[PDB]
Nucleic acid binder design. Structure first.
Ligand code: GTP
Ligand code: MG
Lengths: 44, 76, 48, 117, 160, 482, 154, 66, 222, 56, 52, 110
RNA sequence: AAAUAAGAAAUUA
């Protein structure tokens, strides 16, 4: 490829390989079981 | 180092000295150390114009040999 | 290079095996040995 | 920086704030703990040594590195040359002296002999 | 380069003791000085208060006096020395000059030619080197002379 | 993931027991399959890449070990340090954790020195030349380099070799104390009664072996005693007599007892004695106590007219110099008098003072790292201010620093105290090492501190871009399979 | 503990909603971690929290991903489920902090702020020197001087 | 120019005595103080037969009552 | 028993010889004594064995992981004598103006200093502030230790600048200096948005609002 | 409470601690008459008298 | 505001309107780009040896 | 408010406890931690915390907060069912009892 | 009372 491409285009950008461009992504994942349906007591 | 590996039965990697030697061995060993130190100093005194020094390995080897001699003497 | 670096393989070769292989390869070429090469080689041996 | 290189305290008399040496450089000099500049740490000197004697490739200072993939540029004349004295730079200084300096420089604005031979 | 608080918080809706918030004149601010500024209780505006205690400019002035005390105090705890007035003759070679008063000239280097650059102002002298000068009457030295370290001596740090 | 294949390498030490369940440290400290030869070409054995530093007796530490890390067993820790440890030293040693020490080159120096002290009478010339005639050393440096730790280590070396050792783990317990009594039988001197009592206690239990053999050459044989109690015949017995009493009696007893203890120490000329004081520089100037205003001494009728201000205004009276503390008096007496070449002071400095830069506000009480620091703000020069030979200590060089950080992180993770199952959130070792270097300046206390703070780094992008690349590679693999 | 006075309790969710400003302020989180580490106990919930929040902060100026309309509402419900997970991961932490802090204060002979429980020592809320002369929630009269939770020697 | 009496003085910052000097503060009057502390020990031994706690004010400290 | 001091492996031997040779050329900072040289060599070998360990732990970790003009390249603006380059940072349009003087350290001990004080002290040891000042050296793939920096505060002075906004301005100053010094380094920097300036300000004071800034006064229906 | 705190400063054998480590009761509590048992006492003092809480 | 309902969030100008697009989010980690490029390239060659 | 002051007092307590060989409070602390630090379970779809109904009060009204508080008041951590505490719970990340911690190490020896 | 150097994210006419 053109030396120009490898000088200017070889960095991470919203074009090339962006880190997530959006709010509210999945930060933390783990392998866990499901909780019971409606574990919260309705109250007061 | 040769002398050292006689005196300590081991290499770089209760024993304070090599075991099972006769007493005459240790006498001759001491003689040998004195001899090495001797020729060391001759060779040094000769070439002194162009400075010559006794590399660390050598010096420390002599010392550890003689220490082994010492501990032989005190166990005996 | 065989001395100081530590080799990363999926089946690591013994120091002695690698040493011998090199030695063999330098003996099969009819090369005249330089003093430095022999010196380095036998420092390999001394500490093995 | 140029003013400070040619600075002499005897010339400062009769000038106002123009007579004051460049703050940072002067205060750095006035500092004694700066005067002792550390040697290039053992790991560093070893690393460089190994690369240029054992491995046959010197370590290039970041300015001598060629960073254009498409060009080869002449290495700047200051590249490995300028040496490191904490007495010179980076500017590091005692707080007492800084206070005194700043205040002096304000109080002296009007002590200027204009008319001089 | 201090991290401490030098500004009194601005008056607002009443602050209460919360995560992340404390009362304005709470005992934990300004080392408990806020006592001086405090009108305790549900203050009845019409009938009661002490006006100066809610005033921004006045309050801030008080706080500033307190900060000044703190600094002064710490600058004096920082001294180990007295100023003695010694006649020109008997003083060390470095002070035999003229020494401009404070904030008058450029902060001044003690001895550039001998490689000492430091404020002459803040140079401190040992009571033991000035002994002959300060207590001539006494005959025998009152303080025994400083013992100094040979920096050429082979000691534990030289690896011998 | 070779987890369920993992067995545990059977326990010889306190240290080997410090390992948590595999599930906790698995990704954080990676497993590997090692194929050796027994009865079949392999039998797969799963080992961990990292293991806690060895647990080494002071006698086993050699020249070859400098800049490495070694561990101290928990019970050795109990044996050798009933006083405590140096100021912050224990912050690296929570209950589950292994107890590490970086063996520095100065550590090796003092280890050699102590090992000679053991039989000093033979080595007298060697020793005296090693300190250049002074009585021992004072170690000085910036805040938060190895000082208090180095002192800890010296206590370890000394007490493992069975030498009688005073250890004052923090000098501030004396000079900046709870309170200050005038000493009972020494006119014009003072005590720190709480410091003194706790000292008399731990000193006794640390040296009890040797101190029970010690016979008293000068102490009165008449000491006041309650019914059913015994006249001390040992130095140990004496120290016991000092601190075991109901208060207030403890208070006067401790005065008498400290005076006689030091009088006994100075009278022993053949048995090596190592005195380790952390923060000597606190003993060489004034304590923070001030002489009582003389009107407390004269008795009073009314405040109305006595010509007395004590109730009206506070005022400062001259500080009590530490040399007028009865304990410090004892020590100074041993330093300054010649004809005591029995005693070795290996001593330390503390720069733990509150920060002051030319303005001070008021410290926020929620966020204050310095609340337990001293108020000092006055300079200390070990050359002019002590009779000891000064030794200087710097920050870690990179060789020390690396070994230390590797320990803090990996042996932390092995003990279940670190990222654990979350290991993929923090960056790799090299990056952490480099960055923590930049932040800390390699100052040891700074390294400890920033190692903890690493939890909060915002701007580290490594695992992000790595994760991204691993993903891309997996999806190309899945497109090639298809 | 220096802050002794009666206080106002805020529901956990509003405390968490402060994000970087308080709940996740780096400074605060670090000395929580210090407390745990010193007690010789892993700080997992703190680390989960720090992870979630770290990332919250990183993307906090971006717009949310574009929503395509669905009769299912699977997207909306999955976003919600993830969100309440994170909320709960942090409730657990918030609980841990209050828990351990109260326990540690019990070991250090510390007196808590007014009307605060310390499990082994003060079961009903501890109070002394309140602006109001009775214990607020018991409605029982307070003794003078302030009640002591610990035996005298120090 | 009238003579030295009018040459203004120099103001030196003279340090307090050093750590090294201050060390001797604990040896000031050493003999007298040891010899005395033995007598004080007698006074203490005796006083401690009567009362549980012996104050310095029963031994070497003077406090004027009236 | 005893341990030997003399070099154990062939590796140690080789490095030990190197250190000797360096000592004979009298290069700065090299140990004159043989004991020091030994300590040095042992320590070095141990460091390299560590590096190999971290690389292995990485390879293993990698498997168990969970999941048109471009940019303006300029010439270098540097003082030919002092070898210094000068950038400026801003935040809040007024409050924070910084100027970084950046110069290359050939001894490899670099340091950053702000208004005459070490960076640690100035930012109050808070890591999440100081790493912002580290970032430009990262993005540019540089070793921060090859550079000396001094930052100068040209804005509103305050006793403590440790806070994230001030740090943003700092990071920017450093990055602009770095770009004047190593021109090509501009392209990574610009893409990671270091050189980019955000324009934000506290609202101007104004007596209409209660707090002086954002809060309108109480309203009642007539 | 005022002269007590001052006397403690002048006894000097505590020295810097009085303001820094030591805690004192708040103003209105410290003003209670000796013998005070219940907190209610603060509110049981006479309101017919203009002492500014300096009355029993 | 005054006795009237608050505007919906979308009726205010953008909260970050004054922050440049290169800042939201920051693309940091540029240092690693080249690295992974080489890596991937290298891997491709590895994956030929298996096949061929 | 947990303060650096408290952290130092904590360190000293922890140390003094280690040296007197008191293992008990460490064990209570370990227990507490083991109980309440377990990983909370991913909620089922359809499960969310209730918001306050619009068109009930005006947006500036107290009722809003009064609801939130009264909700969180009713869900006490003893009512949190999404975190798995109990004797029934298997805890892979943690050590089960006193006998598995390092100060017991002598019994772990063969 | 507030989406403005702060940190809030999904039920238009
Ligand atoms: N294992 C080990 N840890 C060390 C060593 N040096 C420092 N540390 C750690 O780093 C911290 C440095 O703190 P101190 O050693 O107490 O610092 P200091 O020199 O006494 O400084 P000041 O008391 O503040 O004058 C210690 O608490 C140790 O945890 C060391 O040589 N070996
Ligand atoms: Mg210390």
């Amino acid at each position: 490829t053109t030396a120009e491409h490898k000088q200017q285009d070889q960095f991470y950008s919203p074009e090339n390989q962006p880190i997530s461009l959006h709010r509210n992504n999945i930060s933390y994942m783990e392998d866990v079981g499901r909780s019971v349906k409606n574990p919260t007591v309705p109250g007061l | 180092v040769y002398l050292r590996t006689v005196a300590t039965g081991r290499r770089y990697e209760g024993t304070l000295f090599a075991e099972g030697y006769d007493f005459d061995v240790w006498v001759r060993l001491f003689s040998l150390v004195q001899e090495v130190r001797h020729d060391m100093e001759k060779f040094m005194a000769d070439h002194t114009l162009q400075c010559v020094e006794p590399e660390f390995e050598c010096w420390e080897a002599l010392l550890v040999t003689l220490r082994c001699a010492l501990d032989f003497c005190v166990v005996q | 290079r065989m001395v100081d670096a530590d080799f990363d393989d999926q089946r690591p070769v013994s120091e002695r095996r690698l040493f011998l292989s090199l030695l063999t390869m330098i003996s099969y070429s009819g090369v005249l040995y330089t003093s430095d090469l022999m010196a380095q080689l036998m420092e390999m041996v001394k500490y093995s | 920086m140029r003013e400070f290189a040619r600075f002499d305290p005897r010339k400062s008399r009769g000038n106002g704030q123009k007579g004051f040496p460049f703050r940072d450089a002067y205060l750095t000099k006035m500092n004694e703990a700066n005067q002792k500049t550390p040697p290039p740490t053992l790991e560093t000197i070893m690393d460089r040594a190994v690369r240029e004697h054992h491995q046959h490739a010197r370590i290039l200072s970041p300015l001598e590195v060629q960073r254009d993939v498409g060009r080869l540029e002449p290495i700047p004349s200051y590249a490995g040359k300028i040496n490191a004295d904490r007495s010179v730079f980076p500017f590091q200084w005692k707080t007492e002296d800084w206070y005194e300096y700043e205040v002096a420089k304000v109080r002296n604005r009007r002590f200027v002999f204009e008319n001089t031979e | 380069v201090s991290t401490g608080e030098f500004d009194h918080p601005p008056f607002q809706f009443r602050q209460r003791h919360t995560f992340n918030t404390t009362p304005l004149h709470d005992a934990n601010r300004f080392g408990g000085r806020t006592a001086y500024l405090r009108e305790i209780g549900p203050v009845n505006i019409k009938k009661q208060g002490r006006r100066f205690k809610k005033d921004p400019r006045t309050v801030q002035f008080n706080v500033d006096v307190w900060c000044a005390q703190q600094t002064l105090r710490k600058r004096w705890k920082q001294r180990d020395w007295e100023v003695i007035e010694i006649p020109f003759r008997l003083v060390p070679r470095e002070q035999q000059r003229v020494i401009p008063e404070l904030y008058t000239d450029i902060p001044q280097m003690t001895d550039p030619a001998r490689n000492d650059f430091s404020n002459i102002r803040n140079k401190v002298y040992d009571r033991e080197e000035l002994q002959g000068v300060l207590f001539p009457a006494a005959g025998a030295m009152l303080y025994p002379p400083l013992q100094r370290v040979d920096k050429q001596a082979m000691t534990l740090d030289k690896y011998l | 993931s070779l987890a369920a294949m993992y067995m545990r390498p059977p326990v010889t030490c306190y240290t080997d027991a410090c390992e948590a369940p595999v599930a906790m440290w698995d990704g954080a400290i990676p497993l590997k399959e090692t194929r050796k030869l027994k009865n079949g070409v392999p039998v797969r054995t799963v080992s961990r890449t990292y293991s806690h530093p060895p647990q080494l007796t002071p006698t086993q530490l050699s020249f070859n070990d400098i800049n490495s890390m070694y561990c101290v067993g928990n019970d050795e820790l109990i044996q050798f340090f009933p006083e405590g440890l140096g100021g912050r030293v224990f912050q690296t040693m929570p209950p589950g954790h292994p107890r590490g020490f970086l063996y520095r080159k100065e550590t090796h120096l003092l280890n050699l020195f102590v090992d000679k002290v053991q039989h000093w009478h033979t080595k007298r010339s060697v020793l005296s030349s090693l300190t250049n005639g002074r009585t021992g050393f004072i170690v000085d440096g910036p805040t938060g380099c190895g000082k208090s730790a180095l002192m800890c280590q010296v206590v370890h070396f000394a007490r493992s070799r069975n030498i009688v050792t005073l250890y004052v783990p923090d000098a501030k317990v004396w000079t900046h104390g709870e309170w200050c009594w005038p000493s009972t039988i020494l006119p014009g001197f003072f005590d720190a009664p709480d410091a003194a009592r706790s000292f008399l206690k731990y000193f006794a239990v640390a040296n009890r072996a040797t101190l029970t053999s010690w016979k008293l050459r000068c102490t009165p044989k008449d000491l006041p005693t309650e019914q059913g109690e015994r006249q001390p015949q040992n130095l140990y017995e004496l120290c016991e007599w000092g601190h075991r009493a109901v208060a207030p009696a403890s208070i006067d007893r401790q005065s008498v007892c400290v005076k006689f203890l030091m009088d006994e120490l100075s009278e022993e000329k053949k048995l090596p004695v190592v005195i380790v004081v952390d923060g000597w520089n606190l003993f060489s100037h004034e304590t923070h106590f001030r002489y009582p205003h003389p009107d407390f001494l004269r008795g009073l009728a009314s405040f109305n007219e006595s010509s007395t201000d004590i109730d009206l205004y506070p005022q400062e009276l001259p500080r009590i110099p530490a040399s007028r503390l009865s304990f410090v008096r004892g020590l100074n007496k041993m330093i300054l008098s010649g004809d005591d070449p029995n005693k070795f002071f290996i001593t330390c400095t503390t720069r733990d003072f509150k920060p002051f830069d030319g303005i001070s506000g008021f410290p926020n009480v929620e966020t204050d790292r310095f609340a337990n620091s001293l108020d000092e703000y006055a300079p200390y020069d070990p050359e002019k201010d002590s009779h000891f030979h000064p030794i200087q200590i710097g920050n870690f060089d990179e060789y020390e620093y690396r070994s230390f950080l590797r320990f803090l992180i990996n042996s932390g993770e092995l003990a279940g105290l670190g990222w654990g199952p979350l290991w993929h959130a923090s960056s790799d070792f090299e990056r952490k090492l480099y960055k923590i270097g930049f932040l800390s300046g390699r100052n040891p206390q700074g390294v400890v501190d920033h190692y903890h703070q690493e939890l909060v780094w915002r701007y580290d992008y490594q695992r992000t871009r790595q994760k991204q690349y691993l993903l891309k590679r997996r999806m190309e693999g899945m497109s090639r399979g298809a | 503990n220096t802050f002794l006075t009666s206080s106002v309790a805020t529901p956990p969710i509003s405390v968490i909603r402060t994000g970087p400003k308080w709940w996740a302020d780096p400074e605060r989180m670090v000395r929580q971690k210090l407390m745990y580490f010193t007690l010789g106990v892993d700080q997992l919930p703190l680390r989960r929290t720090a992870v979630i929040q770290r990332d919250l902060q990183r993307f906090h100026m971006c717009k949310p991903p574009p929503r395509v309309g669905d009769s299912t509402g699977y997207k909306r419900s999955r976003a919600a489920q993830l969100n309440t997970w994170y909320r709960r991961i942090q409730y657990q932490e918030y609980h841990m902090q209050h828990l351990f802090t109260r326990h540690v204060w019990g070991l250090l002979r510390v007196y808590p702020g007014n009307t605060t429980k310390i499990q082994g020592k003060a079961d009903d809320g501890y109070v002394g020197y309140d602006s109001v002369p009775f214990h607020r929630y018991n409605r029982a009269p307070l003794p003078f001087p302030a009640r002591e939770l610990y035996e005298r020697r120090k | 120019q009238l003579g030295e009496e009018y040459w203004p003085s120099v103001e030196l910052k003279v340090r307090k005595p050093s750590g090294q000097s201050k060390a001797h503060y604990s040896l000031i009057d050493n003999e007298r103080i040891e010899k005395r502390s033995r007598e004080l020990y007698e006074k203490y031994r005796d006083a401690k037969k009567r009362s549980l706690f012996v104050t310095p004010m029963e031994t070497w400290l003077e406090v004027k009552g009236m | 028993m005893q341990k030997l001091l003399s070099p154990r492996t062939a590796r140690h031997a080789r490095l030990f010889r190197l250190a000797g040779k360096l000592a004979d050329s009298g290069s700065p900072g090299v140990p004159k004594s043989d004991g020091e040289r030994l300590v040095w060599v042992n320590s070095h070998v141990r460091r390299d064995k560590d590096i190999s360990l971290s690389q292995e732990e990485e390879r293993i970790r990698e498997l168990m992981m969970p999941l048109q003009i471009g940019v303006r390249i300029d010439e270098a603006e540097v003082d030919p004598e002092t070898g210094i380059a000068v950038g400026r940072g801003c935040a809040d349009g007024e409050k924070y103006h910084f100027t970084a003087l950046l110069r290359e350290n050939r001894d490899h001990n670099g340091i950053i200093t702000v208004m005459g004080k070490p960076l640690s002290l100035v930012l109050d040891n808070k890591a999440w502030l100081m790493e912002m000042v580290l970032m430009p050296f990262d993005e540019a793939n540089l070793d921060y230790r090859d550079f000396d920096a001094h930052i100068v505060s040209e804005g509103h002075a305050m006793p403590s600048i440790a806070n994230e906004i001030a740090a943003f301005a700092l990071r920017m100053a450093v990055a602009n200096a770095l770009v004047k010094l190593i021109p090509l380094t501009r392209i990574p920097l610009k893409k990671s948005g270091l050189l980019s300036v955000d324009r934000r300000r506290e609202r101007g004071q104004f007596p209409g609002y209660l707090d002086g800034k954002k809060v309108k006064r109480r309203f009642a229906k007539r | 409470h005022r002269p007590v705190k001052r006397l403690f400063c002048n006894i000097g054998l505590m020295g810097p601690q009085i303001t820094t480590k030591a805690r004192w009761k708040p103003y209105r509590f410290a003003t209670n008459p000796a013998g005070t048992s219940k907190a209610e006492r603060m509110y049981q003092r006479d309101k017919t008298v203009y002492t500014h809480g300096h009355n029993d | 505001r005054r006795g009237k309902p608050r505007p919906r969030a979308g009726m205010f100008p953008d909260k970050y309107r004054r922050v440049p697009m290169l800042l939201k989010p920051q693309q940091g980690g540029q240092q690693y780009f080249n690295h992974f490029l080489i890596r991937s390239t290298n891997d491709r060659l590895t994956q030929q040896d298996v096949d061929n | 408010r947990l303060t650096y002051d408290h952290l130092d007092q904590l360190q000293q307590w922890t140390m003094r406890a280690t040296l007197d060989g008191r293992t008990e409070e460490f064990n209570r602390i370990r227990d507490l931690h083991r109980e309440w630090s377990q990983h909370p379970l991913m909620p089922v779809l359809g499960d969310v915390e209730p918001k306050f109904p619009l068109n009930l009060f005006k947006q500036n009204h107290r009722a809003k907060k009064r609801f939130l508080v009264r909700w969180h008041k009713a869900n006490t951590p003893a009512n949190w069912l999404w975190m798995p505490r109990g004797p029934t719970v298997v805890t892979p990340l943690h050590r089960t009892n006193p006998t598995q911690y390092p100060e017991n190490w002598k019994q772990m020896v063969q």
